[PDB]
Amino acid sequence: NFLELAESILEYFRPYLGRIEIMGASRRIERIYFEISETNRAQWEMPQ
């Protein structure tokens, strides 16, 4: 229910919500969520 109510926020922040997986100190795979800046995304999307 909360996710359905927050669809708009999630859709807006989808491009800027980056997620990765790492092998943490606990020796288990952990998912990390961070922020991708608009400038970083544009620079990465530049054709060169």
Partner: protein
């Protein structure tokens, strides 16, 4: 040989994950599993 090299690169990227190296066969157990894994879970762009 050059054509084979290009085809090998394409096949490797299409059938295996760049980061973890697990084959697309395991991921495809879930619908569009490999696509979701390579676009969200293990995106090299996300790592950068």
């Amino acid at each position: 040989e050059l054509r084979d090299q290009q085809e090998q690169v394409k096949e490797d990227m299409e059938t295996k994950c760049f980061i973890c190296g697990i084959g697309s066969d395991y991921f495809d157990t879930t619908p569009h599993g490999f696509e979701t894994h390579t676009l969200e879970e293990h995106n090299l762009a996300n790592y950068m």
